[PDB]
Design a protein around this ligand. Structure first.
Ligand SMILES: NC(=O)c1ccc[n+]([C@@H]2O[C@H](COP(=O)([O-])OP(=O)(O)OC[C@H]3O[C@@H](n4cnc5c(N)ncnc54)[C@H](O)[C@@H]3O)[C@@H](O)[C@H]2O)c1
Ligand SMILES: Cc1cc2nc3c(=O)[nH]c(=O)nc-3n(C[C@H](O)[C@H](O)[C@H](O)COP(=O)(O)O)c2cc1C
Ligand code: SF4
Ligand code: SF4
Ligand code: SF4
Ligand code: SF4
Ligand code: SF4
Ligand code: SF4
Ligand code: SF4
Ligand code: FES
Ligand code: FES
Ligand SMILES: [Zn+2]
Lengths: 470, 129, 583
């Protein structure tokens, strides 16, 4: 509702900036706010606007665009503000188009979300009826227009230069930089790209004042950040925390603790580009500077929490297989170097791995970290680097001991019956495909671990449930 | 939903191809329209729509092979969708696959499909005809 | 131009805008590896072998793609860069088949030079490669993806500078590979047998059809007599694969070598080219005097004429009914020599060399037949000849010199310049000026269109009553754009259109042995082909004009009457048909 939005102090930000303050002044204010990029870049955002306006253009036109694409699975962050309040979103590019001198722009939205795609077109239509988007904006000489672009959320397309090639209609081809997209972007003339969450606080900082935004948080990073929790958690939902939050407070008192009486081992943040944060650093703060020394990245703002029941090797390839199909394939590191590590632990999880290979991943670790072209490549071993610094020992349970204490790493376990609880009904023996179960009536059946495929069809075939992963 | 070859190729390609700007652009917008009402992307008709556009086939076929955002040819008459997500892999359906391999025909991946989780995880596995 | 400052290894340098680190370092005697880059065409940096350390950077950057800035100090001898490139070379080595004893170029493959240069010691990384198939069905060019390392340069050179664009990338991960449209063979799709597809691939994944076994079968039969043939431009390329300095004529030496191989008769393309130029001048006079279809266009290359008949069937009535010179030589040799020497036509075999790879297509064509017999039954290339002579492996550098035989091997400079770019029109205007106005010209002023290189325009006053315009277009983009403007009919005024399939003349043809991208950096090789050809031309001590040869008029009033006789209309001119298109 456009009338309910303007009753929430709606579009007051565009009224003041088009009548009082110069485009030079709005750049100086965000530098006083200390805002930096929340998309994962880590660069100061207002600094790139200085390059954007001051650059030389052959035709005098400049583009400004927005990033509304979500990369990490389960990271439901950008979609909520799209379905919650998109009027502040479209208001923000009009502030952005005022600062650098833009007349046209585009919005990139995924076609797989029927919730917000139909909603945002309604917002665009009503805004131009008031005169907000279009010509003669608030009786001024600045004209800015928009056109919706319907993407489908390709995971490799989230890269900055990939948005430019997406609207050009070619494949999602990341080109090397320099020249920068804020210097040579669409049609060889500068563009501006920012995430929706950056555009959220823009009407706030101009109305409330940037001194309040710098009043909350640490000295290095100012302001607040939003996350989207997930994993084995008691309570699922959305949280709004400021700068200054530690891990042990967020998992227990706010997160609701570990469900079903289990205990914490490690928590993954940042999706496939981040890493796993164990119990040893629960007292630590979360920050741009803090996590990069800890071996992770903020990512899309997700959170994956874990319990005892999962194998750390099993969660290790559970991220990288998602990125295996999502490489664009052009640099040889992110093309063939990625599958190199898959076949290593695949023999390990089956038990074909051999000694001396714990050091073997580290030479490939520094290579794809260094010579990767798009940002997927160097952050592909970011789970791999973190898991071997802190959790190095339990690989030898799979290398030497050939046991999986978690009980999900399948091809090396064993099944043991509990003769106290099991009656010996033999229902599991009939449903065993390998005929590896032997025994008689009223006596618990005995197992041959040599013949089992370890498919595990027998364990639920026991109504008593006395079969254990030994 | 799928009104065969002739009238739809004519109707949809004589209507919403002829615009300006969006160099491939809105062609991707009609590509999804094809999988909105064909279920596949035609082989010999990319050449027809391209000669209507006057641009060769390598870039559109490259767009087709680049994204996995749509489907291709293989459709005999029906499809058999076995739900094999993580919760469904806890349940498992391998003996059912072995069962159809000895009666119906070949293994997964060949016509005589693979599905992500669609909902209703409590009744795993799900057979989708 | 804008002057910008940098420091390379502590040495200051001022360069204009657009200068990258790679070319400036090469200018300042610093050498950096590359597979990704080629001049003006392919700039992606995707090989990631050209890494140089830049101070203050978060990660390393590729030298070819990185543009310079003011005052950046950079180094190229760190442990970081050497270990990174060692890791990447170890990684990229894993795919291509290490069976280098059967790699077609073998010693010239520069990947081998990078391997022996960067001190790669072991291969710790075994594994499984892509999906294998070999499309050995095309009559000219065969692919093998087991050796390809996906450098994108083949699709780039076919897409843009040729304006053909029949290749592309498919799949994700390992399923990414270079393919034509909808994975059929190259024989049924709109490939033009360009030959620039094969000459720029860095791994030999693109290959010819080695058809030497039936050469050996033909020479192995004593009852079959063999007649070999030398193209007028092959002799500037043999020493290249013999390591000779630039532009050395090995003409009499290869004549003596092919005589030592035991081949029964030796001849050249020169005389048939002279006959073709005289004939083409005769239909020039016929079409001008009768107001025929304008402009008229020659048929020297099979490539672009196949391109037209597979692409533009509406342009048929402007062609020339005559064939290529090699077909003409084959027909005259199997008719006049056969009748003179009483040797059965089906007991003779004729083999000829020409570096243009499209020729293997026209031997497939059945319509170029004389009394149901193909004009030439077999042909090999310069690389094929190099492989065969290294089978013979005769010690080439110590041969004497010999001359060809009578009648059909005589020499004139007007067809020494036949192999150059535009010498056909030069000889044509020479003979038409000597016939119609008794004018003796050797060189023609050329005004090249500004902004486009490869198109050339002139206006030569053949007669004071009739002035003839000249258009020379070589290179695929040039042919494409002249086709587009003649489609609207903008250039109805001119009379000559010179369409040449390969860029830079047949001295830049496909069959010539490979040169590395490093040697193309210093001097364009077509320049030294031009200098060797021009030194051969200026030293011709007897004749500079085509029709003044006694032997051609001897065969005219002996056997072929006059040009455009009805019998010559049946054996020297024929019609062309359009070809099916499935692009
Ligand atoms: N958000 C996601 O879904 C996602 C996915 C993977 C990784 N990431 C993160 O995003 C980061 C971006 O990758 P990167 O670090 O290779 O790129 P990057 O350093 O270029 O960071 C991206 C942004 O920084 C700006 N930038 C960087 N250096 C600049 C300079 N000198 N002058 C002006 N602007 C400059 C770019 O213009 C761009 O807007 C990754 O390192 C990773 O941490 C994000
Ligand atoms: C490989 C790669 C993938 C990225 N994917 C995304 C994405 O999906 N969503 C997103 O908002 N930003 C992504 N980014 C960050 C963008 O570069 C860009 O920074 C973002 O659109 C703007 O946020 P900022 O304010 O931090 O610049 C990605 C960067 C890289 C290198
Ligand atoms: S790292 Fe290389 S292969 Fe991976 S997405 Fe980037 S360019 Fe493509
Ligand atoms: S794990 Fe499978 S094969 Fe082994 S006993 Fe149980 S049901 Fe039989
Ligand atoms: S495991 Fe269960 S089904 Fe099998 S014999 Fe024991 S009690 Fe019976
Ligand atoms: S291209 Fe491959 S097979 Fe051929 S020589 Fe080079 S490395 Fe060996
Ligand atoms: S076929 Fe040759 S030129 Fe083409 S991409 Fe592969 S290696 Fe490069
Ligand atoms: S032969 Fe010609 S058309 Fe075919 S791939 Fe090579 S350059 Fe392209
Ligand atoms: S111009 Fe090139 S393609 Fe044409 S015949 Fe000569 S070498 Fe062959
Ligand atoms: S994954 Fe099968 S229904 Fe959820
Ligand atoms: S050409 Fe090799 S890295 Fe650029
Ligand atoms: Zn395990």
């Amino acid at each position: 509702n456009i009338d309910e939005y303007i009753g929430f102090d709606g579009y007051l930000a565009l009224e003041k900036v088009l009548l009082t303050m110069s485009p030079v002044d709005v750049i100086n204010e965000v530098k006083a706010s200390g805002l930096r990029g929340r998309g994962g870049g880590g660069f100061p955002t207002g600094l790139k606007w200085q390059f954007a306006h001051d650059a030389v253009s052959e035709d005098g036109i400049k583009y400004v665009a927005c990033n509304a694409d979500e990369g990490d699975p389960g990271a439901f962050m950008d979609r909520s503000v799209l379905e919650g309040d998109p009027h502040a979103v479209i208001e923000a590019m009009a502030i952005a188009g005022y600062a650098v001198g833009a007349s046209k722009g585009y919005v990139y939205v995924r076609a797989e979300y029927p919730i917000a795609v139909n909603r945002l077109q309604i917002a665009i239509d009503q805004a131009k009826e008031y005169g907000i988007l279009g010509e003669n904006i608030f009786e001024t000489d600045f004209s800015f227009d928009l056109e919706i672009r319907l993407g489908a959320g390709a995971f490799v397309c989230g890269e900055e230069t990939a948005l430019m090639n997406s609207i050009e209609g070619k494949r999602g081809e990341p080109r090397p930089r320099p020249p920068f997209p804020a210097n040579k972007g669409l049609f060889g003339k500068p563009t501006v790209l920012n995430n929706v969450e950056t555009y959220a606080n823009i009407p706030k900082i101009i109305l409330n004042g940037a001194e309040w935004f710098a009043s909350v948080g640490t000295e290095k990073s100012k302001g607040t950040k939003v996350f989207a929790l997930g994993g084995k958690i008691n309570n699922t939902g959305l949280l709004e925390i400021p700068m200054g939050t530690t891990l042990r407070e967020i998992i227990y008192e706010i997160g609701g603790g570990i469900p079903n009486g289990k205990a914490f081992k490690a928590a993954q943040t940042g999706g496939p580009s981040g890493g796993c944060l164990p119990e040893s650093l629960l007292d630590t703060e979360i920050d741009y500077d803090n996590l990069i020394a800890a071996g992770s990245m903020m990512g899309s703002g997700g959170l994956i929490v874990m319990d005892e029941d999962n194998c750390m090797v099993d969660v290790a390839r559970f991220f990288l297989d998602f990125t295996q199909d999502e490489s664009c394939g052009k640099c040889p590191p992110c093309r063939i170097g990625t599958k190199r590590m898959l076949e290593i632990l695949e023999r390990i999880c089956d038990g074909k791995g051999v000694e001396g290979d714990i050091e073997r991943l580290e030479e490939l670790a520094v290579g794809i970290k260094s010579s990767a072209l798009c940002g997927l490549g160097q952050t592909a071993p970011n789970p791999v680097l973190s898991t071997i610094r802190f959790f190095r020992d339990e690989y030898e349970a799979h290398i030497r001991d050939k046991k999986c204490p978690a009980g999900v790493c399948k091809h090396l376990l064993d099944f043991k019956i509990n003769a106290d609880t099991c009656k010996g009904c033999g229902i599991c023996a009939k449903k065993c495909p390998a005929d590896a179960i032997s025994g008689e009536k009223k006596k618990p059946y005995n197992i041959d671990t040599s013949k089992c495929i370890k498919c595990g069809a027998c364990i639920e075939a026991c109504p008593f449930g006395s079969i254990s992963k030994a | 939903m799928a009104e065969l070859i002739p009238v739809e190729n004519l109707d949809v390609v004589k209507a919403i191809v002829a615009e300006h700007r969006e160099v491939p652009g809105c062609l991707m917008q009609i590509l999804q329209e094809t999988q909105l009402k064909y279920g596949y992307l035609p082989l010999e008709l990319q050449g027809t729509i391209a000669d209507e556009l006057g641009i060769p086939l390598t870039e559109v076929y490259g767009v087709a092979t680049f994204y996995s955002q749509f489907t291709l040819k293989p459709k005999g008459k029906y499809k058999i969708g076995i739900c094999l997500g993580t919760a469904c892999y806890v349940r498992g359906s391998q003996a059912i696959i072995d069962k159809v391999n000895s009666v119906l025909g070949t293994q997964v991946g060949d016509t005589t499909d693979a599905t992500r989780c669609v909902g209703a995880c409590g009744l795993a596995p799900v057979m989708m005809i | 131009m804008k002057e910008i400052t940098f420091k390379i290894n502590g040495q200051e340098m001022i360069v204009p805008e657009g200068t990258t680190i790679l070319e400036a370092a090469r200018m300042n005697n610093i050498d950096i590896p590359t597979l990704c880059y080629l001049k003006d065409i392919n700039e992606i940096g995707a090989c990631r072998m050209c890494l140089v350390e830049i101070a203050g950077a978060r990660a390393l950057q590729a030298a070819c793609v990185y543009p310079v800035a003011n005052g950046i100090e950079v180094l190229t001898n760190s442990p970081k860069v050497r270990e990174a490139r060692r890791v990447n070379l170890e990684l990229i080595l894993s795919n291509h088949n290490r069976e280098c004893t059967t790699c077609i170029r073998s010693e010239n493959c520069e990947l081998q030079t990078l391997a022996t240069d960067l001190g790669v010691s072991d291969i710790p990384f075994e594994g499984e490669k892509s999906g294998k198939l070999i499309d050995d069905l095309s009559t000219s060019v065969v692919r093998d993806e087991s050796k390809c390392i996906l450098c994108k340069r083949c699709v780039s050179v076919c897409r843009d500078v040729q304006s053909v664009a029949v290749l592309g990338t498919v799949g994700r991960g390992f399923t990414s590979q270079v393919q034509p449209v909808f994975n059929k063979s190259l024989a049924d799709v709109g490939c033009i047998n360009c030959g620039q597809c094969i000459i720029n691939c860095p791994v030999g994944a693109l290959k010819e059809k080695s058809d030497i076994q039936r050469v050996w079968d033909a020479i192995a039969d004593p009852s079959k007599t063999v007649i070999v043939q030398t193209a007028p431009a092959v002799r500037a390329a043999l020493g290249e694969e013999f390591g000779y300095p630039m532009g050395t004529s090995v003409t009499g030496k290869m004549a003596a070598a092919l005589r030592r191989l035991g081949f029964d008769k030796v001849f050249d393309t020169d005389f048939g080219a002279d006959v073709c130029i005289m004939e083409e001048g005769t239909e020039l006079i016929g079409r001008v005097t009768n107001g025929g279809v304008l402009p008229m266009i020659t048929s020297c290359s099979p490539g672009w004429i196949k391109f037209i008949e597979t692409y533009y069937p509406e342009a048929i009535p402007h062609l020339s009914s005559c064939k290529s010179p090699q077909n003409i030589t084959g027909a005259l040799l199997k008719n006049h020599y056969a009748q003179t020497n009483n040797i059965d036509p089906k007991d003779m075999v004729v083999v000829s060399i020409m570096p243009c790879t499209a020729k293997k297509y026209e031997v497939q064509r059945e319509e170029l037949c004389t009394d149901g017999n193909a004009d030439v039954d077999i042909s090999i290339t310069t690389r094929e000849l190099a492989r065969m002579i290294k089978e013979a492996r005769i010690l080439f550098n110590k041969l004497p010199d010999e001359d060809f035989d009578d009648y059909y091997g005589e020499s004139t400079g007007a067809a020494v310049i036949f192999g150059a770019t535009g010498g056909v029109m030069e000889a044509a205007v020479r003979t038409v000026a000597d016939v119609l106005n008794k004018k003796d010209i050797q060189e023609i002023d050329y005004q090249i269109v500004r902004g486009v290189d490869g198109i050339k325009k002139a206006s030569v006053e053949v007669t004071p009553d009739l002035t003839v315009n000249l258009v020379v277009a070589h290179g695929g983009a040039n042919i494409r754009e002249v086709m587009e403007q003649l489609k609207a009919g903008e250039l109805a005024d001119t009379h000559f259109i010179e369409l040449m399939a390969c860029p830079g003349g047949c001295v830049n043809g496909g069959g010539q042995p490979i040169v590395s991208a490093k040697d193309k950096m210093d001097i364009d090789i077509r320049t030294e082909r031009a200098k060797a050809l021009y030194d051969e031309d200026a030293n011709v001590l007897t004749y500079r004009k085509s029709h003044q040869n006694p032997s051609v008029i001897r065969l005219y009033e002996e056997y072929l009457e006059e040009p455009n006789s009805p019998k010559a209309h049946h054996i020297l001119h024929t019609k062309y048909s359009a070809k099916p298109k499935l692009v």
